[PDB]
Design a binder for these strands. Structure first.
Ligand SMILES: [Mg+2]
Ligand SMILES: [Mg+2]
Ligand SMILES: [Zn+2]
Ligand SMILES: [Zn+2]
Ligand SMILES: [Zn+2]
Ligand SMILES: [Zn+2]
Ligand SMILES: [Zn+2]
Ligand SMILES: [Zn+2]
Ligand SMILES: [Zn+2]
Ligand SMILES: [Zn+2]
Ligand SMILES: [Zn+2]
Ligand SMILES: [Zn+2]
Lengths: 131, 505, 505, 131
RNA sequence: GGGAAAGGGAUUUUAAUAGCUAUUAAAAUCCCU
RNA sequence: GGGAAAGGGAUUUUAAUAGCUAUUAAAAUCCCU
């Protein structure tokens, strides 16, 4: 019964995240130690004509970005664990995430390490200009 | 490359995959969105919201290696070194039903302490805003043998209470034994899935109130503590996991355990299975194959207990040799062949099951060899035989006495851990039917330099007096004997032993 | 007066009394010091120091009255109102031996929760500098029936640990039920002596962390807390005490309990005696003599459960009246004789065991009375009979379902407390062998002003549709039915009931 | 076996003190409410020619005092409970206590309410002079 | 469970799609429930 | 207990001391251990 969802290569890191107290630090330590990043992310085909904001309701990637499904690039959705955000609601689910092309290797690490600017909704240090 | 796993399986009854903005993986997306180049597209279709899909937790694998993170699935040798942390663990579960099909959730947890916890069916539910750990529909497993699980579906409590109860039970059990916890399981595939509900892992931590290793984690306080400071803590921190089935066993748990033990019989329950699992692990590690080189750390007054045991052995063996005027002494159970006493000139012989020196002959004792050693004085100091001869001097650990260095064992016996691990068979008085319990007494020959007692066989007590030297000797021997006896050791002697024969000196 | 009591008896073996400067009372002074006018004199004799005399704790009497201090030994009427706090209590003890003779100390404490605590022999010792609560010599009671107490002498733990364990167990049991604790004992003479080890009394206190009544006291913190905040607390604060033997029973506990119950049979242990004591108290207070005027406070959605029960009763009784062509209805178990439903015009009759109105006839129902009511539809809403008739509609509480308003009872039954206390016999499926389990369904006749289900017997479902009014009614009835069923109630009906006969409207 | 020590009339209050968190406050409340004071105290025959200090190794009562056995006028010795003093050692045991004649009714209440002066060892407000 | 849609894995064998493997579907043995 | 000196109470009866009661000592019944 049911239908399979995850590859066996991601099972070790996802179990580690499922058991750890702090999933973000554990995943960052796993990636920085040479472990394989999370594969099986949802990648979107876009004409690269978007505005380029971080999180959007429809794909908005520019020529220097790639659009990903939000739920596939959130560590708490991948591991199916409780989100730490306000009222337990994920900010990535139902929305598409723009990832810079230079960091296409590990979308989950980028979405954990960086946060968008609250004024212009771009990634800080990766497109945000507020000076 | 593309080997799929049953972990995080979508157990809902929906026949179509999720939208690309909601699906957690690529292969969970519905096929109408996917393209040729392994890309996904947005078709501007209406969103299928809200939704609620049960997500399976079957198939965790804790085999990743991160610097600073301890190895939790320990091997055989590390499990042996951590024998004081061994807590058996079994789970009986309920199958998800109604809106869900294809996963199991824990229903009854059972530990080797004899404790069963019944929980409500709780699983992971993925919804359009995130995910929850909430109640799901579940039925007891079908068939005859699981009928006893039918009432338990309506006797379970909430998980946040059961977590604190489990942490409290583990703190009560393992506080004086170790700073660690080691779940000894028979099939870890479901035990680890259930442990994901009440365990947390991470870097090795220190207790907030003291210097002990942190073994419990509190979420509302976001803090770590050891067993003594884990009041109100709802999570177990860094538990080791051991699988007995990986150790070469063939067949189910019951047939393997019943081959070596007849005491843990009873009704079917999770705690009894956990007890059988721990018993089988003890039999595997300390009876069949035994490692003599593994040394355990001291907890409390173990060196003192060894010194007192040596003093009592010297006194008792000297007195038993002098009474009855034995000339030949056989020591059955001396690994090194070192004489215990040498003041009476007697001919010593040594035997052992696994001798460490060629001067000691092999002897796996059986009562049919009673006449082989009938012409002397036999010695059974910490040597365990189901039937002792009539001419014996025996010291045997009573397994029914609770002690820090006494752990539950196989076939009603006990594991005695004092610098080494010895498996002792269950204390049965019927083995001593040809022997009498040795009464307390003292004996000495030291030169002299109030206390009234008729068992202090000395030069002063012959004349009805006592001196200061013999007084302090007798008092310190009383302390040593009290420590030895309160630790659990029992002393038995041949029937014809009379203390009044010791008055000759 | 000069009537002496056995409390604080000097249990030492010394024949001579103490000097006036050391003796606690006048009559404990040695007779060589006493003179006329009931006075003592100092004779300048050498002081007999040091010394160590065991002091008995047998014969406490908590009958003093101080303003602000609650009455702890409550009466029958006050114990009935505190039924949610009832915890059984038995103690098995060891007799003081060696340097002490004439007192008993607790050895095994047992509670109605089924747990047993084994303790080391600890008593009060009076010494020349004061007094201690330290280990004393004690032996198990002689005779055959106490042989099972012989191993327990070497399986006991330290009292400060057992205190915290007892407080933790009582916190786990009584947290959701009440702010109070009530020890139900069979003979309080030794139970109170044992309670002096782990209980403290005083003025009524408030919890440090919340507004609940303080039920536990911590000595290192000198603090008071309720059950939710009693982590690490040593003592139980202000427990009520109840003696079942004072209620007119003659004979020992076993012969009185075996006259009314056959479920609590087993081996002899303190916890089983405590369970038998609580069972006998429940039988005395809620089966033999019943008080209808004592209302109990609401603790968890009792009003909502009552409303849902009334809704479900109305629906199923209307449906049972309309499916079959019954023109005569008997209601066996209606205290007031108020018709449940009146939309179908049928001839109602009422009966009850203890009717509150002359319009209701008396009927202590027995299975031989089936032929007296065989011509009509019998109704058994919360009326318990060991054997139900063929044409019955029955609602019965399943005593095996864990609920906050459900408590353990007599003979395997349960005490259901919802504004009143009802004793329900043990749920046996053999009583309903002539009936079938009533399937879930809804029936309505309200005017019409997605949802697909075949059990919604309405006007819209005849045409394959559903309306907003019937959808909301169906959802709220599903909520009511779910609450009623999850509380524990089970519905059974006569065999010839078919929902398809309800499609006539 | 053993020998009896206490009267039944004192068995009530001594039970209360055996259970209360604060024995001194409970005993004072019991006495002030009209309850019977503790009887059975050891009273010493003295020639009334002593110095008059509070606690002494031999009887020292003046004409306005009475000598009592210390262990019989200490509440923690009467009830056989743990003393609250320094290192658990009773200050009254083995020594005789002088009680003023005007408070001869309740020796235990006087020994719980008052405290000797650390300079001259007399009862404060009852013979102590340190102005 | 009071509650239509009877669970998870390992090994072997079989058949199909794709460019010997991954997935899909079935049978047999064993373990957990 | 591994460990010489076998426990607590209620009722009734009997004997002794002192001026019907308190204590001491014993027997019978019942309860706790
Ligand atoms: Mg099992
Ligand atoms: Mg009992
Ligand atoms: Zn998320
Ligand atoms: Zn910005
Ligand atoms: Zn600590
Ligand atoms: Zn076993
Ligand atoms: Zn000497
Ligand atoms: Zn509180
Ligand atoms: Zn019963
Ligand atoms: Zn309608
Ligand atoms: Zn004192
Ligand atoms: Zn002064």
């Amino acid at each position: 019964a049911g239908s399979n969802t995850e590859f066996a290569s991601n099972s070790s890191v996802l179990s580690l995240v499922n058991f750890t107290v702090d999933p973000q630090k554990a995943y960052l330590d796993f990636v920085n130690a040479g472990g394989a990043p999370l594969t099986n992310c949802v990648k979107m085909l876009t004409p690269k004509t978007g505005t380029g904001i971080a999180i959007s309701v429809k794909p908005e990637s520019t020529a220097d970005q790639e659009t990903y499904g939000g739920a596939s690039v959130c560590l708490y959705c991948r591991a199916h664990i409780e989100h730490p955000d306000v009222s337990g609601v994920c900010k990535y689910k139902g929305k598409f995430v723009q990832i810079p092309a230079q960091c296409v290797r590990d979308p989950v690490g980028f979405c954990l390490s960086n946060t968008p600017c609250n004024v212009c909704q771009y990634w800080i240090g990766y497109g945000c200009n507020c000076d | 490359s593309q080997i799929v796993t049953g972990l995080f399986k979508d157990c809902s009854r929906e026949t179509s995959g999720l939208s690309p903005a909601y699906a957690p993986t690529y292969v969970s997306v519905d096929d109408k969105y996917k393209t040729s180049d392994e890309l996904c597209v947005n078709l501007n279709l209406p969103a299928n919201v809200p939704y609620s899909r049960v997500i399976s937790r079957m198939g965790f694998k804790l085999d990743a290696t991160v610097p600073g993170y301890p190895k939790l699935f320990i091997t055989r040798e590390e499990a042996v070194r951590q024998v004081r942390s061994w807590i058996g663990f079994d789970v009986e579960g309920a199958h998800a039903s109604r809106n869900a099909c294809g996963t199991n959730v824990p229903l009854q947890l059972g530990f080797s302490t004899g404790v069963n916890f019944v929980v409500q069916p709780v699983g992971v539910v993925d919804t359009e805003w995130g995910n929850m750990l909430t109640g799901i529909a579940a039925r007891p497993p079908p068939g005859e043998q699981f009928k006893h699980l039918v009432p338990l579906m309506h006797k379970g409590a909430a998980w946040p209470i059961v977590r604190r109860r489990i942490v409290q039970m583990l703190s009560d059990t393992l506080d004086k034994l170790s700073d660690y916890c080691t779940f000894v399981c028979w099939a870890h595939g479901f035990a680890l899935t259930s442990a994901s509900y009440f365990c947390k892992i991470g870097k090795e931590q220190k207790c907030c109130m003291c210097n002990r290793r942190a073994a419990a984690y509190s979420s509302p306080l976001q803090s770590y503590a050891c067993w003594t400071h884990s009041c109100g803590y709802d999570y177990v921190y860094n538990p080791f996991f051991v699988d007995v089935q990986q150790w070469g066993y063939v067949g189910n748990l019951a047939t393997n355990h019943d081959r070596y033990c007849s005491v843990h019989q009873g009704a079917h329950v999770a705690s009894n299975d956990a007890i059988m699992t721990r018993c089988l692990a003890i039999h595997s590690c300390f009876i069949e194959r035994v490692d003599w080189d593994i040394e355990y750390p001291y907890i409390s007054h173990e060196k003192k207990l060894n010194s007192c045991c040596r003093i009592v052995e010297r006194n008792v063996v000297r007195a038993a040799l002098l009474a009855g005027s034995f000339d030949k002494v056989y020591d059955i159970g001396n690994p090194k062949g070192i004489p215990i006493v040498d003041d009476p000139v007697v001919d010593w012989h040594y035997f052992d099951a696994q001798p460490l020196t060629r001067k000691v002959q092999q002897l796996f004792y059986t009562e049919d060899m009673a006449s082989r050693f009938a012409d002397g004085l036999c010695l059974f100091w910490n040597c365990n035989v189901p039937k002792y001869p009539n001419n014996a001097i025996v010291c045997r650990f009573d397994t029914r006495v609770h002690s820090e260095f006494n752990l539950p064992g196989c076939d009603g016996g006990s594991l005695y851990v004092n610098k080494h691990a010895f498996h002792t068979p269950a204390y049965d008085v019927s083995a001593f039917r040809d022997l009498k319990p040795l009464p307390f007494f003292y004996y000495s020959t030291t030169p002299c330099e109030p206390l009234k007692s008729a068992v202090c066989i000395t030069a002063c007590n012959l004349g009805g007096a006592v001196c200061r030297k013999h007084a302090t000797e007798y008092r310190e021997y009383m302390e040593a004997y009290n420590l030895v006896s309160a630790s659990g050791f029992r002393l038995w002697c041949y029937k014809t032993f009379d203390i009044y024969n010791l008055w000759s000196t």
